[PDB]
From a paper:
Originally discovered in the circulation of pregnant women as a protein secreted by placental trophoblasts, the metalloprotease pregnancy-associated plasma protein A (PAPP-A) is also widely expressed by many other tissues. While the vast majority of the circulatory PAPP-A in pregnancy is proteolytically inactive due to covalent inhibition by proform of eosinophil major basic protein (proMBP), the activity of PAPP-A can also be covalently inhibited by another less characterized modulator, stanniocalcin-2 (STC2). Here we present two cryo-EM structures of endogenous purified PAPP-A in complex with either proMBP or STC2. Both modulators form 2:2 heterotetramer with PAPP-A and establish extensive interactions with multiple domains of PAPP-A that are distal to the catalytic cleft.
To assess the molecular mechanism(s) subserving PAPP-A activity and the modulation of proMBP, we purified endogenous PAPP-A·proMBP complex from pregnant human plasma and determined its cryo-EM structure. As shown in our structure, proMBP itself is a monomer. In the PAPP-A·proMBP complex, the binding of proMBP induces a nearly 30° rotation of the βBD towards the PD, generating an interface between the βBD and the C-terminal subdomain of PD. As a result, the relative orientation of the LGD, PD, and SD remains unchanged in the two complexes, forming a rigid core of PAPP-A; but the βBD, CCP, and CTD have drastic translational and rotational differences and thus constitute a movable region. The comparison of the two structures identified a twist motion for PAPP-A conformation similar to a “butterfly wing-flap”. While proMBP formed a 2:2 tetramer with WT PAPP-A (lane 4), it could only partially form a 1:1 dimer with C1130S variant (lane 5).
Numbering used by the authors:
A (entry chain D): 1142 to 1362, 1371 to 1390, 1400 to 1536
B (entry chain B): 88 to 222
C (entry chain C): 13 to 1073
């Protein structure tokens, strides 16, 4: 696959021949265990020495890349002839795509790039799946044809909201975007909590949905313990009528004794320990770094002469060190239990604008990493 | 409660203040603990830096340590809006060699010297770090 | 006329209408644009984007301004970036220099389907061949959009667009230069898709909905046919340091006329006026010795003596080279060693114990207790009731003390240094030199803080009569002779003169390189010099060297030319003779016809376009009647003390920083006013710390530039400058938005509809390390302060006699046309400057032959020394107006079109020796080069590989020097010791070795060692040496010696001298 010309007709010790390859071929000029880079110029002049050829000159077909998804989007490629020069490949559009165009073949070319596609796989967003307790607000979003990248507005019911919403600003409508793969942004009108019942009557309650919106909580036994969550988030009423199983460091001090409804202070004997309520599937040494367990302040007696924060249920775990907010990242406090050390482990939130682990040998992308989801890196 | 003999390193030979000799101790102690320790075991306070050659020789001495910080004698004594740094031995503060955005980023009330670069960083006084003293 | 759009950064942008069909295979974008200084970082002037879908985006081509270093934002250049639909990567090509923030630039990006090229001012500055094929298919032609001045992500642009032009074919460079020369309509050609005049911006362009349309103004882009700005060299500082300006002073003897210079000697007296600092005998003897020394160099000195009777100022000790902050520093300083100093507060005295014990204070002051470690006897010695203040107080924190700095002395005296060379006297304990002499290019050279500080103990002494000549040479712009060897940063400094030249070292061709020594002869071996072991023809007898005063007796004529040129340049107020400054450059031939020729010349060397009036603002006026002034009064609030309002003496005059992206002492900072002991407060959140810069003459402004020198590298927020509020004389504050800034180029703001006069600005900052170097206000075209002044006139005199009427008329403008030329005759022209009735020195003469060629004719004539010839007379291209080619440009055609060859893709035979990037390392025809393999190093780590030495060197890597930490990007190209840092290597001495093996053992004619770092620490002035030992096959070491490392010698060549026996 080349044109060769020798300036001397006679072949003798000292003659040279210039070989230049044709279009669509890449040179690989090599020697014995010597892999040199390809010459930019087409012409290479080879001279025989001692009756032998000093180098090997070859011209491979120019390797077009295996047809990527970034070449033609939403297509599957079948190339039986390969990816060499002169080869052809076919592409078939996806199931959520329409094949429009005269020819659906891509040709590998001289320069090493696949030719311009003559068929455009056009993706059309269909009707989105329904969401419970939500109504679609846009009339053109009910159709089966929609532009890709636009937003369709779904409004939740009053009392249903996106979780993480503030009390003062309760937003009851969201939007979902038609994505590139024909799907939509996921969104569920699920509220985390209507309102929390007081701890003095916790334990015997049975609700339809737990603490969720419009959940009727009843306590099995004047008035009764039956209340209904309202639109503003409040109830129409309220509930009415020695712990030897302690932890390794747990201490309880009662200012009013063991009377009904009295509140006693809880503490851990170790200075670097905090008392929390651990779930049954959450151990002591495998608490997740994204989880924020509920810290214990007081033990308050209930109507069944028991303790809402039971002392055995109370675990004194290794508490947060006081080294928070000192422009220093620590591996112990790098969790939501210790506010990710006050956000010092992320560049965008630290005050000195540079992440510095306190030990000089810590995993910067590992244990001493930035795990704050409010940071600009995440 | 005095430190060991193997961990103490004697540094002397600075072109400025060749009479004053420093001791770097790799005993990881806090500011108050190491301050009172080298007050009660030696006859001087923590190191007060007054020029650049002392800072450069101290950085050369502590650049081999695995810990990133060493202790110097700086301490912030004041409240309000305009506080004042001062050394532990009562000498005046005339030399300041800080890092980027260091004295106006809050943080700890004590002053430490970084082993990489030699610039000073505000650090918490309860951190167990190596300390430099002199007598 | 010609109209130009003004895009601002607020979001003003356009898009092309869909009727014009965008090019697919080849295109050419030509646009005259005038950028502003402060830009958004990837600013887009013109882009071809796709709005079809958000998959495989940034396809198309975009021209704009973007920084080379993305993580630092230091070097902003014009770029052209292309990514065709068939390609998998985007290729960006950039210009060769930072963009000029106030000048018209003719950008032209062409692409012919295989090569993408960028032309800046008609000279090709970048090319690439990665992108191939057409840009997009005809099927996808509907969704392609052409945005002007912006993008989808609001990458806006601040500046002027004059002549937009889009072509469906890729023009050659000659057609680019033709369209630059001919700015007319190209719509007659069918290939021209779109050329633009902004008479009707609503015809072919539609603005965005949110972003309003940019305003159309009048431009006058092609205002000048001669570029009147001549840049100094890299080692120079002013227009006088230029080679072509100093060549006229060196050649012509009419420039070195005798000049009378007025200087003032100030002696401090008490109130009784009995005790002089200097006696009248040594004053007269120094004046006689000075007039004896400078009579043969045509400089006349007029002595004035001023008697200052202040009893408090006389009792103090004036410290020349000492600092009041160095007194408390425990490092001993030689210059601060006197009785009134206290021997640096005892720090240079060995009786001072190293411990700090604060003794009890009781009664009278003690001499042993007055030291720093005794805390100045508890302040008893500085009390005025105990003893005298002027002999006992050593505490620099006290308001009244024994010693005083000269910079504090000049503030007390406040001597008008604009008319006399003030001489000051101060004591130096080291006594090896005098005080600090202010250079002519410093901002204080005409202020009250400038002059010469001398030592009165050696004043007019038979062995010390030549120090005032040395300091006067320093104050007239002469460096030391040993500047090119001893007063350099490292061995890689560009000003290290290997050979005598006008652009290196002391900027003198006569003075040979030499180190510093006290001998009156040639020195022998020296370790201070990098590569030069010996020197010959050392100027030991020169006044500027370090020889003794009896040895120094001669001035070179080049130093005389520099002194006369700096007296003409900046020192016009000192001389009582009001003769105007000459036109320092010869007149240039712009063009010739069959019956006429046209001449245009530079402005005079004074830089003033108006007559000299003492009591007005005539020195601020430019070529037009605009007024360009700097911040006369600065005021910033003291952060700790409430309503402190400290006045920065820096950040007032003309900008005077050397490294433009480095923290400096010549700049205002928000945290520089506070003491070291107090905690510097952070700036407030809604506004920030502000600088209030007041200008001397309030006027109607049109432009405002701020030289923001240093910005914070780790800067998460968007804009460093929070806002800029112009203070009007009526009391109204006119607020501008948050302005983006760059490190290198000055921030420039164009002000619209500011009818009221503005006397100052306030610059607000949320950054505490921001440094402002200067501010500059430029007024409108007609200023009432410049209407009173009368401009200079110019008279053209020919060596053949001209006509009486032609010679009689004095030209206001700098253009001359004559029709009185014969076709075969030779004419020498010159121009004399006439202010009133008095005339100046003649300009150098231009010899012109009416038949033969010249500099700007367009034909290369090698007889006149023309390496290139283009008709531009513009220094922005590759060919100068002196018709010599510029640095790293090559001009090919007979009408010289020039291209940037230093970073080009191709390698040519004339750049094999010079360039390591385009070609390989240069090996001669009788030699072969073999590179290392399987090398072993002394120190190995995980971060440093150690096997990166195998094979070809890192030719694309640049050589770094004075670098603190080598952890940026050099670990992937070259090996340095990872485990040992420079302070730890300084503490414990160790030796590193690099053992490199070779596959085929051959003879070693030379050893090529390619380095990317000199090894010089930024705090240590010592040079670094490498020792090379050849190892045999019999395992024997042959020493090749110690060699210094320089970035100039990147492939160090070590020649092996083998004995032939």
């Amino acid at each position: 696959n080349a044109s060769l010309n020798c300036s001397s007709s006679d072949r003798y010790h000292g003659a040279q021949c210039t070989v230049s390859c044709r279009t669509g071929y890449v040179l690989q000029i090599r020697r014995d265990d010597e892999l040199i880079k390809s010459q930019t110029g087409p012409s290479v002049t080879v001279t025989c020495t001692e009756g032998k050829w000093n180098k090997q000159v070859a011209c491979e077909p120019v390797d077009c890349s295996i047809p990527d998804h970034h070449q033609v989007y939403a297509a599957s490629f079948s190339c039986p002839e390969g990816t060499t020069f002169g080869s052809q490949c076919s592409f078939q559009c996806r199931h959520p795509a329409q094949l429009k165009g005269n020819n659906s073949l891509l040709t590998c070319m001289e320069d090493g790039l696949w030719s311009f596609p003559e068929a455009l796989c056009e993706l059309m967003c269909l009707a989105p799946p329904p969401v419970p307790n939500a109504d679609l607000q846009t009339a053109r979003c009910r159709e089966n044809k929609h532009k890709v990248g636009s937003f369709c507005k779904y409004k939740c019911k009053p009392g249903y909201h996106v979780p993480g919403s503030s009390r003062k600003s309760k937003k009851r409508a969201f939007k979902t975007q038609c994505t590139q793969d024909g799907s939509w942004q996921e969104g569920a009108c699920v509220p985390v909590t209507c309102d929390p019942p007081p701890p003095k009557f916790h334990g015997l309650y049975q609700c339809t949905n737990g603490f969720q919106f419009n959940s009727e909580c009843r306590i099995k036994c004047l008035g009764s313990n039956v209340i209904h969550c309202r639109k503003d988030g409040t109830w129409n009423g309220s509930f009415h009528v020695v712990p030897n199983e302690l932890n390794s460091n747990l201490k309880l001090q009662c200012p009013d004794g063991y009377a009904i409804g009295s509140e006693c202070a809880t503490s851990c004997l170790d200075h670097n320990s905090e008392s929390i309520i651990l779930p049954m599937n959450v151990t002591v040494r495998d608490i997740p770094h994204w989880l924020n367990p509920t810290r214990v302040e007081r033990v308050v007696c209930t109507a069944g002469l028991k303790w809402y924060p039971h002392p055995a249920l109370i675990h004194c775990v290794k508490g947060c060190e006081p080294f928070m907010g000192d422009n220093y990242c620590d591996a112990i406090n790098n969790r939501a239990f210790c506010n990710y050390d006050g956000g010092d482990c992320c560049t965008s939130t630290v005050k000195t604008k540079k992440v510095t682990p306190f030990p000089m040998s810590c995993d910067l992308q590992g244990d001493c990493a930035c795990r704050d989801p409010q940071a600009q890196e995440h | 409660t005095c430190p060991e003999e193997e961990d103490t390193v004697k540094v002397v030979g600075i072109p400025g203040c060749q009479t004053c000799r420093y001791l770097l101790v790799r005993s990881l102690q806090t500011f108050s603990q190491a301050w009172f320790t080298c007050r009660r075991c030696y006859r001087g306070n923590l190191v007060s830096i007054h020029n650049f050659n002392i800072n450069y020789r101290i950085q050369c001495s502590v650049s081999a340590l695995n810990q990133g910080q060493v202790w110097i004698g700086g301490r912030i004594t004041g409240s309000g809006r305009c506080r004042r740094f001062q050394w532990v031995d009562g000498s005046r503060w005339n030399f300041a060699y800080w890092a980027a955005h260091q004295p106006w980023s809050r943080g700890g009330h004590c002053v430490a010297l970084c082993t990489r670069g030699g610039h000073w960083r505000r650090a918490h006084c309860l951190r167990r770090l190596p300390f430099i003293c002199s007598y | 006329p010609s109209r130009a759009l003004y895009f601002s950064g607020r979001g003003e942008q356009l898009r092309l209408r869909a009727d014009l069909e965008l090019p697919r295979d080849a295109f050419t974008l030509q646009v005259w644009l005038r950028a502003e200084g402060g830009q958004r970082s990837p600013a887009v002037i013109t882009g071809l984007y796709d709005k079809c879908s958000y998959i495989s985006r940034d396809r198309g081509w975009v021209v704009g301004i973007h920084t080379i270093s993305d993580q630092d934002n230091k070097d902003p250049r014009y770029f052209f970036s292309l990514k065709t639909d068939r390609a998998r990567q985007v290729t960006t090509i950039n210009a060769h220099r930072s963009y000029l923030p106030g000048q018209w630039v003719y950008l032209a990006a062409t692409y012919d389907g295989q090569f993408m090229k960028l032309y800046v001012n008609g000279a090709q500055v970048a090319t690439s061949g990665e992108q191939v094929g057409g840009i997009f298919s005809p099927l996808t032609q509907k969704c392609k959009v052409l945005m002007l001045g912006g993008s989808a992500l609001n990458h806006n642009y601040r500046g002027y667009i004059e002549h937009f032009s889009l072509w469906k074919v890729a023009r050659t460079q000659r057609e680019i230069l033709s369209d630059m020369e001919t700015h007319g309509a190209h719509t007659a050609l069918p290939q021209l898709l779109l050329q633009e005049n902004w008479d009707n911006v609503k015809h072919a362009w539609s603005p965005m909905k949110d972003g309003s349309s940019p305003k159309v103004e009048f431009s006058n882009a092609h205002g000048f046919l001669l570029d009147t700005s001549l840049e100094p060299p890299l080692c120079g500082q002013t227009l006088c340091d230029n080679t072509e300006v100093i060549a006229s002073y060196n050649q012509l003897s009419s420039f070195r006329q005798p000049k009378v210079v007025r200087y003032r000697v100030v002696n401090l007296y008490e109130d009784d006026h009995k005790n002089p600092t200097v006696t009248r005998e040594q004053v007269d003897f120094q004046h006689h010795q000075l007039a004896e020394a400078f009579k043969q160099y045509n400089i006349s000195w007029e002595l004035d003596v001023l008697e200052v009777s202040n009893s408090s100022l006389r009792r103090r000790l004036i410290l020349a080279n000492c600092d009041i902050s160095k007194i408390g520093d425990e490092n001993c300083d030689p210059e601060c060693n006197h009785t009134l100093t206290g021997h640096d507060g005892g720090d240079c005295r060995h009786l001072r114990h190293p411990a700090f014990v604060k003794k009890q204070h009781n009664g009278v002051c003690d001499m042993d207790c007055n030291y720093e470690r005794f805390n100045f006897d508890g302040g008893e010695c500085c009390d005025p009731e105990i003893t005298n203040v002027t002999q006992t107080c050593f505490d620099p924190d006290s308001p009244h003390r024994a010693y005083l700095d000269v910079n504090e002395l000049k503030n007390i005296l406040k001597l008008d240094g604009s008319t006399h060379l003030n001489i000051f006297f101060a004591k130096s304990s080291e006594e090896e030199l005098a005080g600090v002499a202010t250079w002519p290019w410093d901002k204080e050279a005409l202020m009250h803080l400038g002059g010469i500080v001398l030592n009165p103990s050696f004043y007019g002494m038979p062995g010390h009569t030549h120090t005032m000549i040395h300091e006067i040479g320093h104050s007239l712009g002469l460096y030391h002779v040993f500047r090119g060897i001893s007063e350099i940063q490292s061995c890689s400094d560009p000003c290290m003169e290997t050979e005598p030249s006008f652009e290196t070292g002391d900027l003198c061709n006569d003075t040979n390189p030499a180190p510093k020594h006290k001998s009156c002869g040639d020195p022998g071996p020296g370790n201070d010099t990098c590569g030069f072991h010996s020197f010959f023809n050392t100027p030991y007898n020169n006044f500027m060297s370090y020889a003794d005063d009896d040895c120094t007796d001669s001035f070179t004529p080049n130093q005389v030319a520099r002194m006369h040129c700096y007296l003409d340049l900046v020192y016009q107020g000192w001389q009582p003779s009001r003769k105007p400054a000459p036109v320092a450059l010869a007149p240039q031939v712009l063009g010739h016809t069959t019956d006429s020729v046209t001449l245009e010349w530079f402005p005079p060397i004074d830089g003033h376009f108006f007559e000299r009036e003492l009591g007005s603002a005539c020195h601020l006026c430019l070529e037009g009647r605009i007024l360009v002034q700097y911040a006369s009064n600065a005021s910033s609030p003291m952060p700790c003390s409430p309503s402190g309002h400290w006045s920065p003496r820096e950040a007032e005059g003309h900008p005077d920083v050397e490294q433009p992206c480095k923290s400096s002492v010549r700049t205002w900072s928000p945290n520089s006013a506070v003491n070291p002991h107090t905690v510097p407060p952070a700036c407030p959140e809604p506004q920030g710390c502000y600088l209030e810069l007041e200008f001397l003459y309030p006027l109607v402004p049109e432009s405002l530039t701020i030289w923001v020198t240093f910005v914070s590298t780790d800067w998460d927020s968007s804009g460093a400058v929070n806002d800029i509020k112009l203070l009007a004389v009526s009391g109204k504050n006119i607020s501008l938005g948050p302005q983006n800034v760059f490190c290198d180029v000055p921030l420039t703001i164009r002000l619209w509809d500011v009818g009221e006069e503005v006397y100052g600005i306030q610059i607000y900052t949320l950054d505490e390390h921001l440094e402002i170097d200067a501010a500059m206000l430029t007024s409108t075209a007609d200023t009432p302060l410049c209407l009173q002044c009368k401009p200079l006139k110019y008279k053209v005199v020919r060596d053949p006699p001209l006509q009486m009427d032609v010679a009689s008329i004095l030209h206001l403008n700098r253009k001359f046309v004559d029709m009185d030329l014969n076709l075969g005759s030779v004419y020498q022209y010159w121009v004399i400057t006439i202010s009133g009735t008095e005339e100046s020195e003649p300009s150098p003469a231009v010899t012109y032959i009416h038949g033969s060629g010249y500099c700007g004719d367009g034909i290369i004539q090698k007889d006149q020394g023309e390496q290139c010839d283009d008709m531009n007379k513009i220094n922005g291209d590759g060919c100068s107006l002196f018709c010599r080619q510029e640095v790293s440009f090559n001009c090919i055609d007979e009408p010289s079109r020039c291209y940037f060859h230093d970073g080009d893709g191709v390698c040519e035979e004339f750049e094999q020796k010079t360039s390591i990037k385009d070609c390989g390392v240069y090996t001669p025809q009788g030699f072969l080069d073999q590179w290392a393999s399987n090398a072993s190093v002394s120190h190995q780590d995980q971060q440093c590989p150690g096997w990166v030495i195998i094979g070809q060197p890192a030719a694309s890597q640049v050589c770094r020097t004075k670098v603190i930490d080598l952890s940026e990007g050099i670990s992937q190209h070259a090996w340095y010791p990872c485990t040992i840092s420079y302070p730890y290597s300084q503490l414990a001495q160790t030796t590193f070795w690099l053992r490199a093996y070779f596959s085929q053992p051959m003879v070693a004619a030379a050893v090529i060692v390619h380095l990317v770092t000199d090894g010089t620490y930024y705090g240590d002035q010592k040079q670094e040496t490498i020792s090379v030992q050849l190892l045999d096959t019999k395992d024997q070491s042959h020493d090749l010696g110690l060699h210094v490392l320089s970035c100039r010698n990147n492939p160090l060549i070590i020649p092996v001298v083998h004995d032939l026996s």
